[PDB]
């Protein structure tokens, strides 16, 4: 492994970022 951790660490943070948006988008849709 040369940059697996770096790529993985980015994939997680990047994925979690989209997850946070999914909640906000769903919240506005659910709330209204």
């Amino acid at each position: 492994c040369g940059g697996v951790q770096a790529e993985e660490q980015k994939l997680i943070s990047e994925e979690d970022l989209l997850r946070k948006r999914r909640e906000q988008l769903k919240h506005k849709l659910e709330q209204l």
Binding site: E8, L11, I12, E15, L18, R22, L29
Partner: protein
């Protein structure tokens, strides 16, 4: 490492999947 491509594969899947869901969501939320 263990699951290099495995974890990366799941990351991309979960990612690209999130953007696809958020896309259709926002696209619908923007109109409403």
């Amino acid at each position: 490492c263990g699951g290099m491509r495995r974890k990366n594969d799941t990351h991309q899947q979960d990612i690209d999947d999130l953007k696809r869901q958020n896309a259709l969501l926002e696209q619908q939320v923007r109109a409403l």
